[PDB]
């Protein structure tokens, strides 16, 4: 069971700086007099580390449920043994497995289960009246657990329950990691006489336990112990004391470290590779002593920022206007067939309008039509009354669907239909439109018939004259201005798209972003995905060329298609990070030199030199740089660059 706390005045968390802390043994091997570099998760030196308070003198009690990243660093400068243990988990609602690590007064146990955690687990310590000793009775950490897998009991560490307000005398560090489901604990007790701003001393953390649990951890909380003496009333609402305590919480991130080993295989010093140029020079040479001279550590490369695309101009508008704005429309049994090819497709005006009634596209989806390029585009056109519009779709059957116009079952086209009653019919009605009512058999898809013979229905021939049992398959349509909506004439245009072995001639519209120049950008001018700047050239191109190469056979000049400018292609920049060192036992600062990158800061002939001040006078030079300019450490005293004297 658990109880809830009451609101009070707390203290905001502050931030402190680490000083060579968070270094542990990365493996279970022995290395003697070895400078070995490994990739593992440590705490970076001189990094921002989150700080919490636990001292009463007020009423500071802040234990948030901090997120658990890949590896954490927990350092406590415990004196009166107020800290008890730690818990882990993801949701803390008896749904996932969760850790319970508590250093009790009798023994240390490691139980991982689904304990029902309250909003603030804590341990309660009372001061007995007859007994002058501090003892713990309120074991309010969780309610119950259902089932679990792993359990462990550590050594019976002796715990002191007495809290004071004096200065700290011991420092304890803890590192918790979870790789491949394996829990790692690193700890070491280090005495110190300090209260704040942890010293710059070095102390490697030895492994303690390797508990196999194999669950997920993303949240963790801290357990603190308070005291209930005779001064406080004894209620956990507004009056309590907690002694004096402090704990630090840090997060680990992966870095590359160079570790020094002595003759008995203990870590003495650590050098980073991504913190200081001097540290990079030390860790690249695999030595702790750097002499004077030039050194190459890494390289430098600029990255592209934007990605511009300029497709060529499009103006070949397809003849979609007159095929839709046609004064005369053919009959259903004599439907027109028009081929559209060798033009830039423009369906934008086709779907942005709303005068049409049907916009169903079978086979292909109309949401992507401008990005599809086809070889042949066909367009039929016929007029049908409003009832026989659903018969156009494949699969359905009817008079129009099987005797006048049949569509294949694998249609990948579109059907456009709209209503035009006033245009297609006058006050007296239209009678110039013919349709077929009878046929010998069914009609194959994409087949039209023109013959107007006499349909035979019976067995006895009628000798080719009008009579019984044989009639005219072709019949006329009647139209009225005041008829029903379903009897009004409707114009239907069917689009068919097919793919052949010929190159594609119908293509959709393309987009073109604005042209940015004199910057390291990426462009794709229909033949290459080149990244680089686009300067203004002074050489003209013949009016048939789009590309351009050089002596070394590299595409470095491409003409922009929409305004006909000739633009050059140049790689952005690249080089190496050279450093000059005064040497050992002489200085500590370095200066960064670039081989050919063009930009305290001095613009030398041999690249860009920063961190070295240029001086006009000339002495004898010792550290070569190039182009008649060297560097030296001369009078405080700093690194200078000058022309060498012969």
């Amino acid at each position: 069971q658990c109880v809830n706390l009451t609101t009070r005045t707390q203290l905001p968390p502050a931030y402190t700086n680490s000083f060579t802390r968070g270094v542990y043994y990365p493996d279970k091997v022995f290395r003697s007099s070895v400078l070995h570099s490994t990739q593992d998760l440590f705490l970076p030196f001189f990094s921002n580390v989150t700080w919490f308070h636990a001292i009463h003198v007020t009423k500071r009690f802040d234990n948030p449920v901090l997120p658990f990243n890949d590896g954490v660093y927990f350092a406590s400068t415990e004196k009166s043994n107020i800290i008890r243990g730690w818990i882990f988990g993801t949701t803390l609602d008896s749904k996932t497995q969760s850790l319970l690590i508590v250093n009790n007064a009798t023994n240390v146990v490691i139980k991982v289960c689904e304990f029902q955690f309250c909003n603030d687990p804590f341990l309660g310590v009372y001061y007995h009246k007859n007994n002058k000793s501090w003892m713990e009775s309120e074991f309010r950490v969780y309610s119950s657990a259902n089932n679990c897998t792993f359990e462990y009991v550590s050594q019976p560490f002796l715990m002191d329950l007495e809290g004071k307000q004096g200065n700290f005398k011991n420092l304890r560090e803890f590192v918790f990691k979870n790789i491949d489901g394996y829990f790692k604990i690193y700890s070491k007790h280090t005495p110190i006489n300090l209260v704040r701003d942890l010293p710059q001393g070095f102390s490697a953390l030895e492994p303690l336990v390797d508990l196999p649990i194999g669950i997920n951890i993303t949240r963790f909380q801290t357990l603190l112990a308070l005291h209930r003496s005779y001064l406080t009333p004894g209620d956990s609402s507004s009056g309590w004391t907690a002694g004096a305590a402090a704990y630090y919480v840090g997060y680990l991130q992966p870095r590359t470290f160079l570790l020094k080993y002595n003759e008995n295989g203990t870590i003495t010093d650590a050098v980073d590779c991504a913190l200081d140029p001097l540290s990079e020079t030390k860790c690249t040479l695999k030595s702790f002593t750097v002499e004077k001279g030039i050194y190459q550590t890494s390289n430098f490369r600029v990255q592209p920022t934007e990605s511009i695309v300029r497709f060529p101009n499009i103006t070949n508008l397809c003849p979609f206007g007159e095929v839709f704005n046609a004064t005369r429309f053919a009959s259903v049994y004599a439907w027109n067939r028009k081929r559209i090819s060798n033009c830039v497709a423009d369906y934008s005006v086709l779907y942005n309008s709303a005068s049409f009634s049907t916009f169903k596209c079978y086979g292909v989806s109309p949401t992507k039509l401008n990005d599809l390029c086809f070889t042949n585009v066909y367009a039929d056109s016929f007029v049908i009354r409003g009832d026989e519009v659903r018969q156009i779709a494949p699969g359905q059957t009817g008079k129009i669907a099987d005797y006048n116009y049949k569509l294949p079952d694998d249609f990948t086209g579109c059907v456009i239909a709209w209503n035009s009653n006033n245009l297609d019919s006058k006050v007296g009605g239209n009678y110039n439109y013919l349709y077929r009512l009878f046929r010998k058999s069914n009609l194959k898809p994409f087949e039209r018939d023109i013959s107007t013979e006499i349909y035979q229905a019976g067995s006895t021939p009628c000798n080719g004259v009008e009579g019984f049992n044989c009639y005219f398959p072709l019949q006329s349509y009647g139209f009225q201005p005041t008829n029903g909506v379903g009897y009004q004439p409707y114009r239907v245009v069917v689009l068919s798209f097919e793919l052949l072995h010929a190159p594609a001639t119908v293509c959709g519209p393309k987009k073109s972003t604005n042209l940015v120049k004199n910057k390291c950008v990426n462009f794709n001018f229909n033949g290459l995905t080149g990244t680089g700047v686009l300067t203004e050239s002074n050489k003209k191109f013949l009016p048939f060329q789009q590309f351009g190469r050089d002596i070394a056979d590299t595409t470095d000049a491409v003409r922009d298609p929409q305004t006909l400018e000739i633009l050059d292609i140049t790689p952005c920049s690249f080089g190496g990070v050279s450093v000059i060192t005064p040497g050992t036992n002489t200085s500590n600062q370095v200066a960064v030199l670039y081989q050919d990158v063009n930009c305290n800061v001095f613009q030398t002939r041999a690249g860009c030199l920063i961190g070295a001040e240029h001086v006009n006078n000339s002495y004898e030079c010792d550290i070569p740089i190039g182009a008649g300019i060297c560097a030296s450490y001369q009078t405080s005293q700093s690194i200078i660059a000058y022309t060498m004297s012969l």
Partner: antibody
Amino acid sequence: EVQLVESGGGLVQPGGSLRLSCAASGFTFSSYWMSWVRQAPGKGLEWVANIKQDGSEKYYVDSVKGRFTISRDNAKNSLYLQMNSLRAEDTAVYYCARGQLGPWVGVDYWGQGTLVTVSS
Amino acid sequence: NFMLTQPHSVSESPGKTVTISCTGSSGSIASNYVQWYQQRPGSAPTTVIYEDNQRPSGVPDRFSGSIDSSSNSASLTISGLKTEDEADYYCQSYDSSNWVFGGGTQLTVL
């Protein structure tokens, strides 16, 4: 990621005039169809009006025909809705609806909306 | 007078496949595209099914749609029936220059 902001309601008037505004960002306003959709509190969805990407063609429902108007502009990327001669049925939550290709693709865009009630 | 007919309380079921039918009377709904809209109660609506066969990006593949032209009805099928289904659904069509919306099918008990 497209932001739609509507702030045109919050007051009651019988038979007056009201001006609702929807603000849009993150896309090109002058190339897709636009619409306005309202729903009654506790009732189902119903369509109100639509407008082309250039404002040339506008349509409404027959219940609000005669009254109502819609206008747009592409310079400041905003949609304008104006109402007149309101009734008691007009208690509704109005969302500015954005299209992709036309009236067949789908609404698929419902701005959070603004609560609009009318009382005497 | 185009309108769409669909129920109001269906799919009150744990963890299996259930279909919801929306149908019209004035005309054939298979002529034009019909889409399904899915709305948080007390928040902005969204869309689960568009184009009548596809779904927007980020929508789980549990939802699916089909068209039956014999009964002139549109079917929406949900497979997972997980805990993220507390909504009312609508079917929307397009007859001629106007939009028509469905009544609404409340689904709360999952």
